Amino acid sequence: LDNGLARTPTMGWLHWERFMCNLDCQEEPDSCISEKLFMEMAELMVSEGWKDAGYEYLCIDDCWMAPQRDSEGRLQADPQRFPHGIRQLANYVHSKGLKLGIYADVGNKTCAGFPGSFGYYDIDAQTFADWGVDLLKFAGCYCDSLENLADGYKHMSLALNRTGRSIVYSCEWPLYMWPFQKPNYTEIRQYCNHWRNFADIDDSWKSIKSILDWTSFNQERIVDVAGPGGWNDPDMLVIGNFGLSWNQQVTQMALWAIMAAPLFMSNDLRHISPQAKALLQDKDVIAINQDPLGKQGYQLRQGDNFEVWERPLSGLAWAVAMINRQEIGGPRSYTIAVASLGKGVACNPACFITQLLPVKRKLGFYEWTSRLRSHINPTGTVLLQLENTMQ
């Protein structure tokens, strides 16, 4: 989408995976979807280093709306859980230097059952602009027609543009098109800043595997269309929660960087381990994800329960990620000729290789003819950066 936004993958926090559609502010006050939750999460984004690391957008997912529209047909925030409304929450977020994301649906209803935007696209776009929203996640539930789906996504895109307000437009168009026909990605990119391709993530290693496997399987369709202003979205980062081991968390961070994915944390910043914080705030790995060249990475190799992925970066650098998919035993040895990496360019005549994950270590100079030997933990990933040099 040619709107001057998302020139690098958008970074921020989105409530869905960790907080879902909890409406019980009586029995579950700390996890219910409320202005207080977003206020507190905003504060922590500032005070705990997230904004400095790059996490800029504080985004509300589904279940923020009142059951009805108002007397003017405009969307409202629920009056019990968001008494001060979206406009004032938007002021609170901007005063902290952050930006605000909100959520809406192409259909008659949102996935959770609240008012959809079908037939109100221009009204909703303007309300979002008037409120000072900075990002829109636009879902695809309760749309049974292919024509409607495409029409709605296109219409809303233009409707946002017409408000004159800079709003990152996050689409679920391709995901909700899979049931009808293969998506046209040139068209989707024309209208969207990023796009969900695959099923909702959850707090499990199974879910990570499935996203990587789908992405690698479909990579000839989706990799080359990614670039500044239009990214593939493999869904939220779930590092910091309950279901991934340390190594699985490392795999997610590594591969989301390799994949030029948007980085939307879905976790609780009030209760997050120092280990997870440091991984999520890892300057070098974020720098890979945010590389200005903006070329999405891909799977180079697959075999013997190993995968090798790589991503080209600016200034002749490459990130290389090696996964061990064997879920039994101990650290497994993997070796590759550095001339097979980075299309034969990375280490010609030589490169300097720095290991970034699971720990940071300078590995040294590698000649074009030489071999990189690495040990990889089960369900873990080793992430390296290759700097082309003459020394």
Place this chain on the structure above:
Amino acid sequence: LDNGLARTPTMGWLHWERFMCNLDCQEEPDSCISEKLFMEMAELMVSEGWKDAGYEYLCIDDCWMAPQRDSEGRLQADPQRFPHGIRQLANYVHSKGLKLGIYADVGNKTCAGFPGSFGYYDIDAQTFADWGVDLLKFAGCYCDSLENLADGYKHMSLALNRTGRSIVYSCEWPLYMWPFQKPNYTEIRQYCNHWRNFADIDDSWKSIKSILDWTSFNQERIVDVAGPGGWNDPDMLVIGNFGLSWNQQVTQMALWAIMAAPLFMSNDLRHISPQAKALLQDKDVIAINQDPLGKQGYQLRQGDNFEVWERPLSGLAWAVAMINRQEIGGPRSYTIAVASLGKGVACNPACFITQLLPVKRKLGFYEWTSRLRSHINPTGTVLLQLENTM
């Protein structure tokens, strides 16, 4: 098995899940199956608190043998990887106050392809006794009929007995007859100290779920046969490795206690996090697993992606474990009338409830009318001990 052993579930360390059948001592000398590896684990079992916690048996799994038997038909350990021989390794292990487990197969080969014990049962038993072995894991690969499977497991049982040495006998009998015929657990118990029921574990949450699910599904026929001298074996603890989250590790520890399972760690004691060490050495949770009554726990409830399991303990005490099987979102609230716990006698007229996992906390006195409210992390378990006030 009426041999005076495994009066509580056997506790120790077994190499398989973490080290498998690595024969490459040339390229990976510190992780290949060798005399050195078990020496290191033995030392660490003493110096790092494992023995004191209860982990007593240092057990060798498959891939310790030489390819051939010797010219007398006795099994041998691999000459390069185990240069001093098993007996010498047993001497070492005993000098540290520990006990030694070895591995063998009822069929024509071990699962990894080394000499099986079929037709050598009495010879092998005696060799193991002469070596000073203290435990035998006896697998079921390369056995072509149910009759010879049963015959072999029975024969070896008696053969071990007749050596006059005390040897914990770990069977895989039920696992290998399950696909063809329902097992008679009364018979298995008669011959075995514990028995593997289900597929090999690995370093994943998927594998943990599968074991729990199979165990709960089959509980009507395996729970009541367990007791001092005969335990159900849901396989090794994999806490300390790579594939389980903290909460999934907690779930394994909690449920293995509830299940009166043998506690065989399979990990690397040279590289293990303080978090995992403390969970594996948790005095209160081990005390549940080791409860002298020896009555296996069971699933009480299942619904709304929650499970409740419970185990009766000595002196009118109970353990209760609550699992959250929903793998999305955050800590979920679960509530239950304490009168539904412990068959209605745990908290009559009252009980004192101490949460043990994921952290230890006194919860206080609960009346027979009361309700236990708890929040449980996704893929996590909360473990409580109920003390009847009387």
